[model samples]
Target: KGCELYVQLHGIQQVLKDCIVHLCISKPERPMKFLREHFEKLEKEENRQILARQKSNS
Candidate 1:
């Protein structure tokens, strides 16, 4: 997965665990966490809007 590539580049063994650690620990400075939370929030809203639109169209 393209998302797991970050961990692989950083020599991390487990991608998801490394992602959380990368978000929590130093060196990476937690931008991954910030971006993930922000994007998921936006995606949820977008999905809600899409469902509403689909219901209206139907």
Candidate 2:
């Protein structure tokens, strides 16, 4: 189902829960936006790491 694959490589399971916890604990009345931003930041962070690693040929 790609669940294991997704979590195994990108670790969303490791990172996603914290946001949900925070979301429940503190509501800004924008759950939809908050959820998107969480994944958005996750992708951005992972991409940042990949971008850094891409330049190393030595």
Which candidate has the highest TM-score of all?
2
Native-to-model Cα distance after best TM-score fit, residue 58 in candidate 1, in Å = 1.6
Candidate 2 per-residue C-alpha lDDT over 1-58 given as tens digits, one digit per residue, 9 for 90 to 100: 9779968886667677798797888786889888897779878988898888887743
- Superposition error at 22 for model 2 (Å): 1.9
Candidate 2 regions with alpha-carbon error over 4 angstroms: none
- Model 1 — TM-score against the truth? 0.49
Model 1: per-residue lDDT, tens digit, 1-58?
Answer: 6857876785556535655664666545568677587558767987999999999998
lDDT of each: 0.68, 0.81
Runs in model 1 with CA error above 4 Å?
1-28
Clashes of 1: 0
Cα-based lDDT at residue 31, candidate 2:
92
